């Protein structure tokens, strides 16, 4: 069902962010595991799985609108050096993702592509919930201190 060219472009833009998130979160998940912070590893792994399912729905929407999914042009992964930096990279990644999501919703509404708008809103509702985790985690590090925070995520 021929889609607007600019809708497919926003869609591929969102898709590209999800592909960054997939590789960033999956590497953070495995770094934390290597370090023995198994609870953070498991939680970051599910974030990456979530971004994958988001990617999948975007790929499907694009193909339906007779666009071409772009899985070739991987942007800049924000790999952090240690736990607090890893969280603060996920968060800045997520703040870029939510901005692009809103701009895409704005266009989808202009061109009346209301079903793609709903797909992006659902993805955005989930990214905001990730921001919440992130914000909450960074504030717990300040309240309980890094040594306690890290101890709490040793075990699952």
**DSSP labels, 3-37:** PPHHHHHHHHHHHHHHHHHHHHHHHHHHHHHHTT-
Q: Which residue has the tokens 């772009």?
A: 70
- Select the binding partner of residue 53 from a second copy, ligand HEM, K ion, none (C-beta < 5 to 8 A, by kind): ligand HEM
In the complex with ligand HEM, the residue whose CB is nearer, 94 or 149, is 94
Residues 21, 51: contact at Cβ < 8 Å? yes
Count the residues of the shown chain that bind a second copy, applying the rule CB under 8 A: 56
Integer angstrom CA distances of residue 86 from 25, 64, 149: 9, 36, 14
CB-based burial label for 145 (10 Å; 0-12, 13-18, 19+): exposed
Integer angstrom CA distances of residue 127 from 54, 94, 117: 10, 7, 15
Binding to ligand HEM by residue 55, rule CB under 6 A? Answer: yes
Subset of residues 68 to 87 that bind a second copy, contact rule: CB under 8 A: 69, 71-72, 74, 76-77, 83
- Select the binding partner of residue 139 from a second copy, ligand HEM, K ion, none (C-beta < 5 to 8 A, by kind): a second copy
Distance from the Cα of residue 75 to its chain's centroid: 13
Helix count and strand count (H, E) for the chain? 5, 0
Measured at CB, which residue is nearest to ligand HEM? Answer: 55
Binding-residue pattern over the window 5 to 44 for ligand HEM, x denoting contact by CB under 6 A: --------------x--xx--x------------------
In the complex with K ion, the residue whose CB is nearer, 36 or 64, is 36
Residues contributing to the site for K ion (CB under 5 A): 148
Residues that bind ligand HEM (CB under 6 A): 19, 22-23, 26, 49, 52-53, 55-56, 59, 71
List binding-site positions for heme b.
52
């Amino acid at each position: 069902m021929k889609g607007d060219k600019k809708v497919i472009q926003h869609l591929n833009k969102i898709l590209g962010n999800e592909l960054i998130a997939i590789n960033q979160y999956f590497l953070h998940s495995r770094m934390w595991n290597d370090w023995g912070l198994k609870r953070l590893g498991a939680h970051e792994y599910h974030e990456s799985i979530d971004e994958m399912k988001h990617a999948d729905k975007l790929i499907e929407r694009i193909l339906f609108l007779e666009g071409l999914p772009n899985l070739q042009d991987l942007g800049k992964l924000l790999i952090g050096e240690n736990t607090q930096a890893m969280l603060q990279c996920d968060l800045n990644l997520e703040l870029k993702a939510t901005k692009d999501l809103r701009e895409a919703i704005v266009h989808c509404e202009q061109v009346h592509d209301y079903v793609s708008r709903d797909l992006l809103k659902d993805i955005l509702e989930s990214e905001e919930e990730h921001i919440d985790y992130l914000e909450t985690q960074l504030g717990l590090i300040q309240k309980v201190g890094l040594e306690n925070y890290l101890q709490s995520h040793m075990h699952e």
